[PDB]
DNA sequence: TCACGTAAGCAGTCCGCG
DNA sequence: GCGGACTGCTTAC
Ligand SMILES: Nc1nc2c(ncn2[C@H]2C[C@H](O)[C@@H](COP(=O)(O)OP(=O)(O)OP(=O)(O)O)O2)c(=O)[nH]1
Ligand SMILES: [Ca+2]
Ligand SMILES: [Ca+2]
Ligand SMILES: [Ca+2]
């Protein structure tokens with residue numbers, strides 16, 4: 012096999028590299044890498060190196076990396092550009108791996124670990140590490156084993172050994188229900204004392220040194236705690252054995268509000284699963300506890316125990332250890348579904364970066380572009396200082412708030428990357444500028460044609476047409492990868508709907524799920540067999556189809572994220588290729604494209620309907636248009652359709668055969684107008700929406716920009732077994748909205764769109780009558796909690812104190828004195844409840860850490876003083892009033908002449 | 913919330929609005 | 931009471 016790196020570090024004048032050799036073995040080497048950098052030279056001098064603008068450069072080879080860094084400094088002192096890759100480990104990887112990397116994940120040691128620390132006096136601070144580490148579970152991907160290190164003797168209690176037999180038993184047997192599939196994979200090691208435990212862990216770590224290190228909050232808790240605890244017991248040198256090169260650095264992580272400290276282990280790539288989840292999952296959660304996320308992702312029950320966690324080891328050590336083991340497994344289960352480790356490895360090896368750099372698209376793109384240019388003997392420019400400047404973004408149409416019965420939407424494929432490719436936008440393709448007219452003039456095609464030579468954006472920029480820029484070239488590669496995975500995702504989605512259909516008529520038989528590849532549309536033969544399957548087999552196939560869809564979604568949406576982040580990176584001052592001319596060229600072109608096609612669609616439809624000035628496009632945001640299809644349906648007549656599917660088919664055919672060709676012609680004209688390099692504005696039908704045939708449902712409504720709901724029957728070629736609510740921006744979609752309220756508002760919307768006013772009124776009446784029975788957590792609002800200290804004036808709210816911060820200050824006074832009570836963490840999320848006038852907390856609201864039950868010291872009083880009326884008005888009635896008034900209907904029955912008889 | 917971008921909605925504070 | 935200036939937080943794209 013071809014070799015591939017695992018980790019790379021610069022330490023002084025050496026590169027330290029862990030890699031897999033040509034025989035599949037893990038090796039380590041120290042290399043005295045001599046980097047090269049570049050300077051401009053006279054034209055009359057013979058060279059093969061040129062900068063991206065075509066100016067000749069001389070290569071300077073340095074005795075060592077420090078000499079290269081000091082040369083960069085002197086060049087600044089002189090006032091001359093120092094060209095080339097200044098991150099020497101990226102240059103090393105580029106030199107050492109000058110081919111497309113084919114990696115074997117089975118040779119990469121991926122470690123997933125979790126620790127337990129008993130602490131009576133509050134949260135055990137990693138920087139202090141003053142309490143014993145009393146449990147470690149460490150899963151190794153190569154061994155496929157859970158290594159359990161269990162402390163039996165502590166100043167906080169002496170305990171008996173954990174029993175794997177009781178661990179395996181049902182909770183109804185007094186057991187812990189550790190999943191049977193991992194029982195045989197547990198390697199249990201009890202310890203007489205903490206020093207023994209930690210020494211053995213370090214020996215273990217040395218034998219099985221993680222390459223990728225993950226877990227849940229490992230970077231903020233587990234790693235710095237273990238490091239600092241070993242440091243406290245044994246000294247720094249022993250703690251540094253956590254690094255395969257015995258080098259660590261305290262790293263200060265700074266944000267807008269403050270700073271925290273992590274430990275950097277040289278020679279290890281830490282990918283904390285919480286951070287992977289936050290970047291790559293496209294969720295915003297009310298809580299990021301492992302229990303909360305595990306329930307959301309896997310539908311597993313909350314890990315139940317009695318009393319505080321600080322007393323769990325002493326009261327029930329058996330459960331204590333089992334739950335530590337289960338916590339490690341939960342992360343593995345989440346990754347088996349979401350596949351973020353696979354994604355990170357794919358992206359990291361593609362770009363030739365340290366794997367942990369996948370969090371940074373700026374770093375990722377710097378490496379991709381550097382490697383690409385190096386292939387042509389081209390030389391990258393020096394990164395420069397830039398002041399942060401605002402620049403314009405997308406266009407969003409102001410909709411007329413209303414119900415909209417029949418709606419068909421259309422959307423541009425991968426817009427910003429398609430603009431980059433169409434226009435040929437890149438640092439080195441800038442050809443000059445032209446005199447700009449108002450955007451309106453380009454939109455309406457009355458402005459003078461910008462150029463007869465170059466490819467243009469309506470921000471005034473011109474680009475070369477003779478050759479693709481490096482940015483278009485490299486963005487195209489990742490776009491094409493994304494396209495493949497999106498195809499797999501959509502096929503799995505369509506396949507899932509087939510199974511859902513068949514589930515309406517399951518067979519009474521014993522059988523097995525079919526062995527199929529869900530990434531490809533089911534054949535006729537598979538379809539025939541599916542129709543003969545039991546509900547058990549069908550449900551298993553559905554689960555598998557949905558897992559395939561999720562895997563496809565991870566792969567496609569995050570490649571979309573990477574390419575969109577290149578468009579954004581052009582507007583970030585730390586990007587080597589930062590250029591507001593280019594960032595704005597993209598966004599302004601987008602504004603034109605959307606409003607151009609709005610005009611074209613309105614013109615086309617006014618023509619076919621024989622009208623004038625009628626607004627068929629009701630809304631658009633960035634790259635999408637929403638078209639009123641009422642007049643199209645009315646042209647054949649609702650009574651002419653056999654069922655809902657019949658008019659959906661009709662609108663599908665109309666979009667495909669009439670509208671898409673009209674849209675295409677309109678965009679080809681725009682391409683010619685801007686003289687672009689390549690026509691890539693591909694706008695396809697997205698959603699077909701409307702009420703069920705024969706119903707009183709309203710189909711859809713808009714309340715304003717970025718706030719709408721549609722009853723969708725078909726989305727991007729997926730014909731749903733049951734209609735799907737597409738709700739954007741409304742309170743149902745916000746993590747700040749109480750869980751039970753999201754649910755109730757969603758049902759109000761469902762009834763509005765599918766059933767009509769009377770159904771809505773019936774439901775509202777019931778919710779208002781019963782909502783006081785709902786669990787307090789389900790009706791609590793949620794908010795991030797920043798700058799608590801800023802608004803804290805002697806325990807009370809200062810001027811302009813936000814409502815949720817007021818709640819936290821209330822909480823802090825009510826728990827004051829208690830070291831044991833859960834503390835609200837700065838920057839984390841809280842639940843928030845309003846309190847009735849005259850309550851013992853002395854304020855109008857209270858907040859506590861999200862994902863948790865409020866402490867038993869104040870729970871009874873919170874429940875008693877909860878202001879249900881205010882809660883209902885703010886979270887439910889106010890938003891529903893917004894929905895219904897927009898839709899022109901009433902959530903409460905109006906008085907009529909029929910009342911009373 | 914260390915880690916690409918802008919547009920834009922709503923909650924809530926403060927205070928005006930005769 | 932609403933709304934404007936503002937902070938804060940959260941979505942859509
Ligand atoms: N910089 C940046 N721009 C974004 C992001 N999300 C959306 N945009 C901009 C660029 C997109 O091309 C454009 C339209 O977004 P869409 O959600 O419709 O996705 P896009 O067209 O890229 O992909 P698609 O092929 O429709 O699935 O909006 C983002 O996360 N970062
Ligand atoms: Ca724990
Ligand atoms: Ca799009
Ligand atoms: Ca599409």
Ligand SMILES: [Ca+2]
Pocket residue numbers: 513516517518541542543544
């Ligand atoms: Ca059947």
Ligand SMILES: [Ca+2]
Pocket residue numbers: 422423633634635
């Ligand atoms: Ca879109």
Ligand SMILES: [Ca+2]
Pocket residue numbers: 671693694695
């Ligand atoms: Ca098309």
Ligand SMILES: [Ca+2]
Pocket residue numbers: 800801802803804805
């Ligand atoms: Ca203070």
